[PDB]
From a paper:
Anti-chemokine activity has been described in the extracts of tick salivary glands, and we have recently described the cloning and characterization of such chemokine binding proteins from a tick salivary gland cDNA library, which we have named Evasins. Evasin-1 is a small 94-amino acid protein which binds CCL3/MIP-1α and CCL4/MIP-1β with very high affinity (0.16 and 0.81 nM, respectively), and also displays lower affinity binding (3.2 nM) to a closely related member of the CC chemokine family, CCL18/ PARC. This chemokine-binding protein does not share any relevant sequence or structural homology to any other known proteins, notably the viral chemokine-binding proteins, and moreover, is considerably smaller, being only 10 kDa compared to the viral proteins which range in size between 30–40 kDa. The Evasin-1 secondary structure is composed of seven beta strands forming three anti-parallel beta sheets, one short alpha helix, and contains four disulfide bridges.
We have determined the crystal structure of both non-glycosylated (accession code: 3 fpr) and glycosylated Evasin-1 (accession code: 3 fpt), to 1.7 Å and 2.70 Å respectively. In order to obtain non-glycosylated protein, Evasin-1 was expressed in the presence of tunicamycin, a known inhibitor of N-linked glycosylation. The crystal structure of the non-glycosylated Evasin-1 contains two molecules per asymmetric unit, monomer A (Asp5-Asp91) and monomer B (Gly10-Trp89). In both monomers, the extreme N-terminal and C-terminal regions, comprising the six-histidine tag, are flexible and were not seen in the electron density maps. The overall structure of the Evasin-1 molecule is boat shaped, with approximate dimensions of 35 Å × 20 Å × 13 Å. The four disulfide bridges consist of: Cys12-Cys33 connecting the N-terminal region of strand β1with β3; Cys29-Cys70 connecting the beginning of β3 with β6; Cys46-Cys75 connecting the strands β5 with β7 in the beta sheet β5-β6-β7 and finally Cys65-Cys84 connecting the other two strands β6 with β7 in the same beta sheet. The disulfide bridges are positioned along the interior of the protein, forming a central core, and undoubtedly conferring structural rigidity by stabilization of the protein core. The N-terminal region is anchored not only by the disulfide bridge, but also by an intricate hydrogen bond network that places the N-terminal segment in an exposed and favourable position for chemokine binding. The C-terminal loop points to the solvent, presenting the aromatic residue Trp89 totally exposed and located in a flexible region with a Cα B-factor = 50.0 Å2, much higher than the average B-factor  = 34.8 Å2 for the whole protein chain of monomer A (B-factor for the Cα of monomer A  = 32.8 Å2, calculated with BAVERAGE from CCP4, 1994).
Numbering used by the authors: 7 to 91
């Protein structure tokens, strides 16, 4: 063991409910894949990082299938919430 461990970056709704922004990631060469059917936003780690903190964005909803966030063509307001910045 020693493989993986990296947690998934999350967007949140106004009150703090988290949703992942990617359905897979690479952790030091180990791929980690979210369970099929998991709710996600199809914006990616990059997308979350580009969001201005504490501002509302219309985030595209999806559902994980084999490591990919498959968009539902629906949207929900989501936020990037830093500890500090």
């Amino acid at each position: 063991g020693d493989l993986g461990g990296c947690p998934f970056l999350v967007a949140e709704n106004k009150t703090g409910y988290p949703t992942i922004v990617a359905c897979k990631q690479d952790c030091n060469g180990t791929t980690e894949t979210a369970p099929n059917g998991t709710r996600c936003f199809s914006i990616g780690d990059e997308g979350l990082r580009r969001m201005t903190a504490n501002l509302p964005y219309d985030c595209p909803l999806g559902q994980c299938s084999n490591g990919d966030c498959i968009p539902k063509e629906t949207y929900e307001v989501c936020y990037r919430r830093n500890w500090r910045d």
